[PDB]
């Protein structure tokens, strides 16, 4: 007799649990698209200083006289001759493959070239802020309401960023877009896992991963179809508007409704879910007197997490792991322009490599365990992207294959760390531990553009940092115990006994 008892009594496979779930997980395609979009909407095209309009191009022997050349046979991208002097008359961007990008629009090249990555950094800051603040807001207020608000804020911020006069406007609107986007991403999963039985959470997670991969595919296709950034952002943001229009039929989470100490509206929601499921004879007996008799056992953070020494150590380790994994993953994903091959093809391959990597890590965890899977995936990813950084541009196919293997390894590592933190933390603080791990992952995704910021120092040092971090994470995560034997600890007492008894 619990919430799952009522849920099974009403159904679990009926039309509601399919329609609501698929409606709420549909925008994960645009989740992935919006997360990666900065790569396509801010790609730098070849550019060079513009000769002054007063000078006669015909009488000066062409533009080749006014543009100093670099090694690769191209005109210098920041300097120009005085007959030197930096760009003072703007820039010239070729339109062979990019009709327009934010760098083309607002000349984020040479001096003040930091902004094309500061934009992504601010967007990730918005993601983290939205995640934490709207997690608190969802706990305080509800799920359906906050998800609808995130829908609307995401749509509005996407449109406003698509039509942005200045650059600070664009950065602020990206920040608010992330503010809403992290919240929708977390709340969709929480609502799905709260409106389903216990034995379907794995199915929900697998479906979420599949929708994310399909979102990578959709972003690749939509970028191939629409190259213009102003059209691209609007076209990737307006389906959020249509989904907000059609998402007023959502049913709120009944578990959280019961958790509020009030049950009449919970009864109303359960009656409604009985109506939509088409099963009324079994749902007729539902009434007030059965709610308390069925839900009474369960009715009866950072400070305690940081106090206990074992808890503090487990935090520090898991936070480092999450931080390194997300940091490396987003550092690798955000940079695909410099791979030689067209961004659409490499994006398609990156999306495709998700499923085989998922199958590989599933086979490993169901065959050997979790900690060796972590070691293998992280070490292979770090080595692969380090070799990518050390291989010069002159080679293309090998670099792209290494990058694809690295992306697959990061995806497998993400799945593995999710499962490992699920089967590692005690049930007393497991949810808070997951929250802290996710927050540290968002911190890593925040820092990754900051690390890529300083590529002005060395041509490929950001790749070196991205490849150095996960080897350190793998080295420091060695002490972590393996949970293949299914200990499933509850409180801190089990952890010490299990560690001693391991």
């Amino acid at each position: 007799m619990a919430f799952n008892d009522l849920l099974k009594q009403v159904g679990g496979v009926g039309r509601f649990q399919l329609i609501q779930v698929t409606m709420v997980v549909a925008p994960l395609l645009l989740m992935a698209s919006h997360n990666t979009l900065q790569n396509f909407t801010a790609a730098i095209p070849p550019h060079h200083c513009r000769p002054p309009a007063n000078a006669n191009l015909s009488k000066d022997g062409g533009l080749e006289a006014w543009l100093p050349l670099d090694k690769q046979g191209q005109p210098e991208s920041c300097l120009r001759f005085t007959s030197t002097e930096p760009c003072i008359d703007g820039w010239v961007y070729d339109n062979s493959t990019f009709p327009s990008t934010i760098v083309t629009e607002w000349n984020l090249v040479c001096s003040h070239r930091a902004f094309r990555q500061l934009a992504q950094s601010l967007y990730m800051v918005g993601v983290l802020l939205g995640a934490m603040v709207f997690g608190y807001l969802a706990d305080r207020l509800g799920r359906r309401k906050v998800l609808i608000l995130n829908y609307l804020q995401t749509a509005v911020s996407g449109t406003c960023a698509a039509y942005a006069p200045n650059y600070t406007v664009y950065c602020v609107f990206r920040l608010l877009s992330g503010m809403s986007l992290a919240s929708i991403a977390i709340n969709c999963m929480t609502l799905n896992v709260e409106w389903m039985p216990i034995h379907t959470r794995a199915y929900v997670g697998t479906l979420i991963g599949y929708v994310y991969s399909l979102g990578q595919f959709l972003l690749a296709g939509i970028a191939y179809a629409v190259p213009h950034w102003r059209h691209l952002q609007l076209v990737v943001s307006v389906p959020f508007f249509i989904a907000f229009i059609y998402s007023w039929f959502f049913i709120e989470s009944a578990r959280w409704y019961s958790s509020s100490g009030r049950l009449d509206l919970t009864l109303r929601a359960l009656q409604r879910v009985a109506r939509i499921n088409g099963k009324q004879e079994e749902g007729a007996k539902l009434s007030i007197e059965v709610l308390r008799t069925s839900l009474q056992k369960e009715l009866t953070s950072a400070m305690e997490l940081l106090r206990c020494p074992t808890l503090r150590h487990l935090f520090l380790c898991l936070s480092m792991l999450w931080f390194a994994t997300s940091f490396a993953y987003y550092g690798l994903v955000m940079d695909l322009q410099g791979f030689g091959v067209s961004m659409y093809l490499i994006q398609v391959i990156f999306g495709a490599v998700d499923l085989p990597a998922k199958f590989v890590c599933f086979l490993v965890i169901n065959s050997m365990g979790r900690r060796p899977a972590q070691m293998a995936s992280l070490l292979l990813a770090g080595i692969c992207i380090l070799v990518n950084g050390i291989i010069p541009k002159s080679h293309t196919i090998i670099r792209t294959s290494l990058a694809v293997l690295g992306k697959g390894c990061l995806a497998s590592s993400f799945n593995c760390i999710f499962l490992y933190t699920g089967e590692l933390y005690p049930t007393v603080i497991r949810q808070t531990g997951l929250g802290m791990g996710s927050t540290m992952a968002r911190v890593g995704s925040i820092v990754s553009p900051l690390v890529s910021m300083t590529a002005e120092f060395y041509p490929s040092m950001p790749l070196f940092i991205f490849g150095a971090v996960p080897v350190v994470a793998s080295a420091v995560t060695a002490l972590l115990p393996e949970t293949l034997g299914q200990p499933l600890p509850d409180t801190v007492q089990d952890l010490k006994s299990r560690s001693r008894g391991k």
């Binding site: 022997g61 080749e64 100093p68 050349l69 210098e76 920041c78 300097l79 001759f81």
Partner: protein
């Protein structure tokens, strides 16, 4: 201040060879870049050749490969040019540039290829 005086001009028939060099003072020639330009009469500045620092690399243009040769030394701290099979279109004033997009460029030498 930094000087980039240069010498090696003369009147020589086509198909000969000259001796061109830039006297670099104030900086080690092995530590910065090096470049080469001509301004033929009736034409404009044209890139010729470049040699990096510490002998990292050296690349040429379409009319420089197989015809000109540029080397460096450390004792005299200078950059030296060698050439052969000169043609009348090569008649130009040659300018020495310390670095790409750099403010230090030499006075130039006048070399003539008399057919």
């Amino acid at each position: 201040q930094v000087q980039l005086v240069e010498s090696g001009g003369g009147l020589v028939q086509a198909g000969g060879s000259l001796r061109l060099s830039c006297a670099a003072s104030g900086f080690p020639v092995k530590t910065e870049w090096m470049e080469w330009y001509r301004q033929a009469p009736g034409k404009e500045r044209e890139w010729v050749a470049a040699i990096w620092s510490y002998g990292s690399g050296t690349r040429y243009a379409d009319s420089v490969k197989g015809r000109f040769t540029i080397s460096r030394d450390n004792a005299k701290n200078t950059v030296y040019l060698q050439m052969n099979s000169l043609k009348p279109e090569d008649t130009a004033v040659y300018y020495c540039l310390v670095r790409v997009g750099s403010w230090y460029h030499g006075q130039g030498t006048q070399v003539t290829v008399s057919a």
